[PDB]
């Protein structure tokens, strides 16, 4: 099943043997059409550039095998959670559903943080579609990992200069 993954990766990556934002967008839009359970206006290029940026830990501007595997495995896990926590079968994650879904993804957040996420990622009814949900979790996962790596003494506080700040806020 690592065999299947390398075949898919080689086909998706083409000549440069890495996955661009455009190649990621095209494969995610293909996968999502096979799941009419997942309401979405589609993965757009800006969301895909953002997902490549937070996953591009070697700074090549595209996803190699290990960066793509980490992202792809996250997307498969979060797809399963999306369907299970869509209790009203809207094809979307409502404000009442989002806490349970994020808890299952391993993010124990307080209601003030849930409110700001719904404000920034959900529509005027407080519903989040599939591309928005995956985009939110890829960023949330990356921002937790960046915080962990900078909080060496485990105090719940990190210190950054302007270059580390721009790297973590702009390359996203």
């Amino acid at each position: 099943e690592v065999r299947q993954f390398r075949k898919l990766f080689v086909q998706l990556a083409g000549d440069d043997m890495e996955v661009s934002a455009t190649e990621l967008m095209n494969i995610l839009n293909k996968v999502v059409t096979r799941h009419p359970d997942l309401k979405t206006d589609g993965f757009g290029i800006d969301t895909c550039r953002s997902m490549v940026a937070v996953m591009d830990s070697d700074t090549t501007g595209k996803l190699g095998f290990e960066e793509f595997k980490y992202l792809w495995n996250n997307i498969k896990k979060w797809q399963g959670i999306y369907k299970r926590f869509d209790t009203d079968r809207s094809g979307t994650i409502g404000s009442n559903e989002l806490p349970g879904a994020f808890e299952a993804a391993g993010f124990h957040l307080n209601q003030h943080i849930y409110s700001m996420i719904i404000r920034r990622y959900s529509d005027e009814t407080g519903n989040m579609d599939f591309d928005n949900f995956i985009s939110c979790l890829v960023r949330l996962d990356a921002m937790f990992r960046a915080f962990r790596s900078l909080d060496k003494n485990g105090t719940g506080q990190i210190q950054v200069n302007i270059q580390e700040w721009l790297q973590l806020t702009m390359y996203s």
Binding site: N110, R148, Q157
Partner: protein, 63 residues
């Protein structure tokens, strides 16, 4: 007796309110109360760490 600590810490735990824990040496730890017993507080930030109550000065929340 010990009748004010449990209600106070359980309310922080249940509502997932961020707390600052100041130690007797002045150092500030921040995160969530994961759990607690007679002697320790399990504080969760990015790791889960054990904080001895005897080394705590104050537990200040964000309401």
């Amino acid at each position: 007796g010990q009748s004010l600590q449990d209600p106070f810490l359980n309310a922080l735990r249940r509502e997932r309110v961020p707390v600052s824990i100041y130690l007797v040496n002045g150092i500030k730890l921040q995160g969530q109360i994961e759990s607690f017993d007679q002697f320790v507080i399990l504080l969760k930030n990015t790791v889960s760490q054990m904080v001895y109550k005897h080394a705590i000065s104050t537990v200040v929340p964000s309401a």
